[PDB]
Design an enzyme around this catalytic site. Structure first.
Site, PDB file in Angstrom:
ATOM      1  N   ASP B  64      -0.015   4.713  -6.955  1.00 24.70           N
ATOM      2  CA  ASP B  64       0.217   3.685  -5.947  1.00 24.70           C
ATOM      3  C   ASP B  64       0.117   2.323  -6.622  1.00 24.70           C
ATOM      4  O   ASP B  64      -0.985   1.841  -6.902  1.00 24.70           O
ATOM      5  CB  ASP B  64      -0.785   3.809  -4.801  1.00 24.70           C
ATOM      6  N   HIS B  66       0.609  -0.457  -5.346  1.00 32.12           N
ATOM      7  CA  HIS B  66       0.039  -1.412  -4.395  1.00 32.12           C
ATOM      8  C   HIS B  66       0.738  -2.766  -4.465  1.00 32.12           C
ATOM      9  O   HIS B  66       0.109  -3.813  -4.287  1.00 32.12           O
ATOM     10  CB  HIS B  66      -1.469  -1.577  -4.606  1.00 32.12           C
ATOM     11  N   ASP B  92       2.746   3.884  -1.344  1.00 27.50           N
ATOM     12  CA  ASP B  92       2.059   2.593  -1.323  1.00 27.50           C
ATOM     13  C   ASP B  92       2.603   1.667  -2.415  1.00 27.50           C
ATOM     14  O   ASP B  92       1.859   0.986  -3.123  1.00 27.50           O
ATOM     15  CB  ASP B  92       0.543   2.776  -1.454  1.00 27.50           C
ATOM     16  N   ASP B  95       2.426  -3.777  -1.018  1.00 30.09           N
ATOM     17  CA  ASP B  95       1.156  -4.086  -0.373  1.00 30.09           C
ATOM     18  C   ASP B  95       0.936  -5.589  -0.278  1.00 30.09           C
ATOM     19  O   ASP B  95       1.867  -6.376  -0.475  1.00 30.09           O
ATOM     20  CB  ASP B  95      -0.002  -3.429  -1.128  1.00 30.09           C
ATOM     21  N   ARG B  96      -0.294  -5.990   0.035  1.00 28.89           N
ATOM     22  CA  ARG B  96      -0.636  -7.398   0.163  1.00 28.89           C
ATOM     23  C   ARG B  96      -0.448  -8.120  -1.165  1.00 28.89           C
ATOM     24  O   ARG B  96      -0.832  -7.619  -2.225  1.00 28.89           O
ATOM     25  CB  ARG B  96      -2.079  -7.557   0.641  1.00 28.89           C
ATOM     26  N   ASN B 124       0.616   4.703   3.383  1.00 28.58           N
ATOM     27  CA  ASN B 124      -0.082   3.923   4.396  1.00 28.58           C
ATOM     28  C   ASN B 124      -0.055   2.431   4.104  1.00 28.58           C
ATOM     29  O   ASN B 124      -0.073   1.628   5.044  1.00 28.58           O
ATOM     30  CB  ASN B 124      -1.534   4.389   4.515  1.00 28.58           C
ATOM     31  N   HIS B 125      -0.012   2.044   2.830  1.00 24.96           N
ATOM     32  CA  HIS B 125      -0.021   0.637   2.458  1.00 24.96           C
ATOM     33  C   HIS B 125       1.373   0.043   2.324  1.00 24.96           C
ATOM     34  O   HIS B 125       1.506  -1.185   2.342  1.00 24.96           O
ATOM     35  CB  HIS B 125      -0.779   0.442   1.142  1.00 24.96           C
ATOM     36  N   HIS B 173       3.366  11.048  -0.619  1.00 20.11           N
ATOM     37  CA  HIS B 173       2.525   9.853  -0.586  1.00 20.11           C
ATOM     38  C   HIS B 173       1.049  10.230  -0.492  1.00 20.11           C
ATOM     39  O   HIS B 173       0.227   9.773  -1.291  1.00 20.11           O
ATOM     40  CB  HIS B 173       2.945   8.943   0.573  1.00 20.11           C
ATOM     41  N   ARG B 221      -6.312   7.225   8.528  1.00 23.59           N
ATOM     42  CA  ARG B 221      -5.593   6.245   9.333  1.00 23.59           C
ATOM     43  C   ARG B 221      -6.063   6.263  10.781  1.00 23.59           C
ATOM     44  O   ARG B 221      -5.825   5.306  11.527  1.00 23.59           O
ATOM     45  CB  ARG B 221      -4.089   6.505   9.260  1.00 23.59           C
ATOM     46  N   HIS B 248      -2.136   6.223  -1.877  1.00 21.52           N
ATOM     47  CA  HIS B 248      -2.625   5.440  -0.739  1.00 21.52           C
ATOM     48  C   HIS B 248      -4.120   5.658  -0.517  1.00 21.52           C
ATOM     49  O   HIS B 248      -4.580   5.861   0.609  1.00 21.52           O
ATOM     50  CB  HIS B 248      -1.832   5.750   0.534  1.00 21.52           C
TER      51      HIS B 248
END
Lengths: 110, 298, 285, 11
Positions: B64, B66, B92, B95-96, B124-125, B173, B221, B248
């Site tokens: 991931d 990210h 993932d 991401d941020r 999930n991300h 994932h 989650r 993730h």
């Protein structure tokens, strides 16, 4: 007989799927400017096209281009019945093929 | 891709290489008409492939990322930059931060130049919605306008879902799911698609490989169905599967082999949120379906 | 010489040097940093931007001492609270959104401010959101409060953005004298106010508006972005009003129930050639 | 002549 068999006049527009319909034609018949209606021709010749709104280009007669007449195997002034064609959905796997007499000369994936 | 598109792809590759080995946060923007055409072509190409893709061995599959430009650049430098090596992210991938856009652009450029050497997935991300993944939607809203954001969302929805490595290792994932039955309905589920809250793809993207459950249960989650060890074993036995990829999650070791080396939970998330010093890793899949744990920095 | 920008992006080091030694540092970037925060914030008086994302610190550092700051990017942080941001009245920009922000505050007023973004907080608390009157662009979207605090006080702003906001109650939109841009996506307002008052807007967002027709769209020959996303659609009177004008560029119907026939899409595209863009696929015009 | 067997002219 039925009023739906309007005379197939000549269309000034060269668009094949466009018929210049009078304001009276677009009004008395359920014929909007974007209504996909079905027209029935000779020897079971049925096709669906668009009905253009041209009051000055039609007088109780469906102005149809020569390409439309050739495709529908119909002559000028023919009383062709028009019915709504809303069941025309997107085809899944439609087989197509060019015409040898018409694709002669256009090289490549024409 | 196209002449302008291929030129932009080469420019983005050069910019990423110049930003390779340095701090993350690359963006790799483009023009207006050129970006619109590139997005349309990428959506058409991604929608052209089925939901269940097949990997080309050998490959250097990462965990991931990210949405990290530095992590992706390090993977390209070590595991093989595109198109010199096939990359397949488990999930993932976004991401941020302002570094997921560069990774997405690089993956799209590599797929346009060589679709057999580029692949990525979401978890999930990296979900398509800001409720589960706001590292893309909020970033696009803050930086760009809404038309480009809608185009990007459509292109992402027009992408594939899963991948397989010589029908040996499943590039998922997270973990297994109780709602996934067979590949007939997976290949039938074409574009568009998204990671849900509950179900099968929802459990793949949000849930992880569960062992406290048997058939189904709750997930991290909170809505996903983290299929337990029994469900994963039954799915592998019925589908003749051997390995499933997991991502993730904040992996302290990066690549964790679960279900007796049948769930390689490879995670390339280095220093997740700073406080969680998660390790980075990759799954080095050889030509003979040899899954190796290619660990990276945390 | 002294560095003009402090980059701490994934620095993987808890201590950052050059913050006080380089007093000319204007971009204190610590986005996706592996450290808590950046020290010597007040030491460098000539600091323009200060980015801090994925910060491991749960609190700000010298968040009020930098009175000469221009951009405060405290966005995407893991800080528990953001305080002291209301002291610096000379901060021309502020980005503290998409962060934890368990206590969103210190956003009362400022003298010289141009950008402000302190949303996406875990607590739906807003303090004095309409106190200053020197702003020209407003970005009030993504409001965690169930209702807007105040919007009638914004009479000098030429740009309004309230997209994806949970503030269901949004009033005072008619109190603005003029506004070049006004985004009201998911505003929770049944009708759009200020259409007659602020008629100089070149963009309009309906976002599946419950109104059947558009509020004076035929007489609106200036809006080049008439977007109505995820429409039912409500009615075709708004469509007729939009088709009456010819100075529109972006038009979104959008995703209505009348698009089932592919001939309907072609007819709509042919009917409206004055719109430069048609929702998603730009109109050939 | 064949149906759904050749790669078609994608747009």
């Amino acid at each position: 007989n039925r009023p739906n068999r309007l005379i197939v006049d000549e269309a000034i527009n060269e668009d094949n799927s466009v018929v210049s319909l009078s304001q009276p034609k677009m009004d008395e018949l359920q014929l909007f400017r974007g209504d996909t209606v079905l027209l029935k021709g000779k020897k079971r010749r049925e096709a669906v096209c668009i009905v253009l709104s041209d009051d000055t280009c039609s007088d109780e007669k469906i102005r149809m281009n020569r390409v439309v007449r050739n495709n529908l195997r119909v002559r000028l002034g023919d009383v062709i019945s028009i019915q709504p064609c809303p069941d025309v959905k997107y085809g899944k796997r439609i087989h197509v093929l060019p015409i040898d007499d018409t694709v002669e000369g256009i090289t490549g994936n024409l | 891709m196209a002449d302008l598109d291929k030129l932009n792809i080469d420019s983005i590759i050069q910019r990423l290489l110049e930003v390779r080995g340095s701090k993350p946060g690359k963006n790799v923007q483009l023009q207006e008409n050129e970006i619109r055409g590139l997005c349309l072509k990428s959506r058409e190409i991604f929608l052209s492939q089925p939901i269940l893709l097949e990997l080309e061995a050998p490959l250097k599959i990462c965990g991931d990322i990210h949405g990290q430009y530095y992590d992706l650049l390090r993977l390209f430098e070590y595991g093989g930059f595109p198109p010199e090596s096939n990359y397949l992210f488990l999930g993932d991938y976004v991401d941020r931060g302002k570094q997921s856009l560069e990774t997405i652009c690089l993956l799209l450029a590599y797929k346009i130049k060589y679709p057999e050497n580029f692949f990525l997935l979401r978890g999930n991300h990296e979900c398509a919605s800001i409720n589960r993944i706001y590292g893309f939607y909020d970033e696009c809203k803050r930086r760009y306008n809404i038309k480009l954001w809608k185009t990007f969302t459509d292109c992402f929805n027009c992408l594939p879902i899963a991948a397989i490595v010589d029908e040996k290792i499943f590039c998922c994932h997270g973990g297994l799911s109780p709602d996934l039955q067979s590949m007939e309905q997976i290949r039938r589920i074409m574009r568009p698609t998204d990671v849900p809250d509950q179900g099968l793809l929802c459990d793949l993207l949000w849930s992880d490989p569960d062992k406290d459950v048997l058939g189904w249960g709750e997930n991290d989650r909170g809505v996903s169905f983290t299929f337990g060890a029994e469900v994963v074993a039954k799915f592998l036995h019925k589908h003749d599967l051997d390995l499933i990829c997991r991502a993730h999650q904040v992996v302290e070791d990066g690549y964790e082999f679960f279900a007796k080396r049948q769930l390689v939970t490879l995670f390339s998330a280095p220093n997740y949120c700073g406080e969680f010093d998660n390790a980075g890793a990759m799954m080095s899949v050889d030509e003979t379906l040899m899954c190796s744990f290619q660990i990276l920095k945390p | 010489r002294d560095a003009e920008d402090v980059d701490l992006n994934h620095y993987r080091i808890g201590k950052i040097e050059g913050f006080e030694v380089l007093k000319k540092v204007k971009t204190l970037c610590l986005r996706q940093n592996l450290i808590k925060c950046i020290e010597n914030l007040e030491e460098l008086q000539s600091l323009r931007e200060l980015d801090l994302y994925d910060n491991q610190i749960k609190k700000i550092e010298n968040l009020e001492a930098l009175t000469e700051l221009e951009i405060l990017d405290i966005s995407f942080n893991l800080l528990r609270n953001i305080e002291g941001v209301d002291k610096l009245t000379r901060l021309k920009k502020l980005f503290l959104v998409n962060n934890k922000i368990s206590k969103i505050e210190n956003l009362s007023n400022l003298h010289q401010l141009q950008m402000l973004e302190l949303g996406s907080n875990r607590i739906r608390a807003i303090e004095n959101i309409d106190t200053l009157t020197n702003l020209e662009s407003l970005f009030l979207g993504k409001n965690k409060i169930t209702k807007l605090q105040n919007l009638d006080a914004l009479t000098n702003l030429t740009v309004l953005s309230m997209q994806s906001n949970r503030l269901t109650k949004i009033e005072g939109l008619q109190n603005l004298v003029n506004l070049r841009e006004l985004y009201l996506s998911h505003n929770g307002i049944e009708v759009i106010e200020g259409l007659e008052n602020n008629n100089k807007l070149t963009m309009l967002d309906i976002a599946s508006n419950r109104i059947k027709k558009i509020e004076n769209i035929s007489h609106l020959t200036e809006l080049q972005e008439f977007w109505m996303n995820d429409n039912l659609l409500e009615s075709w009177s708004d469509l007729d009003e939009l088709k009456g004008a010819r100075s529109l560029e972006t038009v979104y119907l959008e995703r209505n129930p009348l698009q089932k026939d592919p001939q309907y899409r072609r007819k709509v595209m042919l009917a409206l050639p004055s719109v430069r863009q048609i929702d998603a696929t730009f109109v050939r015009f | 002549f064949s149906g759904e067997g050749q790669k078609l002219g994608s747009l």
